[PDB]
Design a protein around this ligand. Sequence first.
Ligand code: SO3
Ligand code: SO3
Length: 220
Amino acid sequence: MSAIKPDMKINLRMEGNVNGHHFVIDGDGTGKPFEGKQSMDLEVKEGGPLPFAFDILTTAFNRVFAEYPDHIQDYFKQSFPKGYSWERSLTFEDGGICIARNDITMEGDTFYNKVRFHGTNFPANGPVMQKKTLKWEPSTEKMYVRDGVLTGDIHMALLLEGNAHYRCDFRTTYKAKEKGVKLPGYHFVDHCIEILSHDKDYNKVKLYEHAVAHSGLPDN
Ligand SMILES: O=S([O-])[O-]
Ligand SMILES: O=S([O-])[O-]
């Protein structure tokens, strides 16, 4: 009923535009759905070298890849073989705003990902456009249903030069392709995302995420 393997390939193409700058990015990677770990090699095919911080894009490059325990419904693994899509708002504290789409589908041992990323109102002297971002801090997503739709909220923070932080609020909606796929209870998903290596101008990046679901206190 699932057909999600313990090892899967990941195939991804992103087209997008931030502060007027258009780009295209390709990803080929591998992951381990049931351990909640994945890794990806990203390559810019148009719009390079990007005039903005690469970190803003990186959560755009699948909650399938998260370790769900048994007492929590796993909507993402239950949305296959047919797949699902998500939509995200990234509200930055200094007025920068991004919206994002991923349409996720499966052929054999490979997830396919049609991704769209649009950003604006980023200040010219901000960390994004000055490229002063170091990494996303690990996070904790909250998952809840709001009018028959699974929703994730995250207080994200980008570490900057000098250990300052640049805030971002995520809200993501998640939508199974198949009707009447069972919504889960209110729960959490810890994340940690990480650029493992990158070339100088970020035309080549190697990314890794690790995520695990939990009920919160007292259970976790
Ligand atoms: O857990 S992360 O730092 O690889
Ligand atoms: O479950 S709480 O009340 O400790």
